[PDB]
Amino acid sequence: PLTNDERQLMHELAVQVVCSQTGCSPDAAVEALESFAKDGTLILRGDTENAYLEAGGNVLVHADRDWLAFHASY
């Protein structure tokens, strides 16, 4: 399972993705992600190779699990 710090890092990467694709501000992107969370479609999951953050059935972020563990723990 993903740790709290790993989930936090995936959320920060998702905010970056939303800002990049929409030109919006980080606060705006956080609001949109929170809307997905309230609808129950903000899904964080992992397999032995990658972690994924999905919003509304679409993958916003995928990160190598070793890279994510390193950057979340150090």
Measured CA to CA, the distance from residue 30 to residue 71 in angstroms comes to 21
Measured CA to CA, the distance from residue 40 to residue 23 in angstroms comes to 25
Q: Where are the domains of the chain?
A: 4-73
Give the strand order in the sheet containing 58-64: 42-46, 50-55, 58-64
Residue 21 is which amino acid?
Q
Measured CA to CA, the distance from residue 68 to residue 48 in angstroms comes to 12
The residues that bridge with 55 in the sheet, in sequence order, are 42, 58
Cα dihedral across residues 25, 26, 28, 32: positive or negative: positive
Resolution (A): 1.9
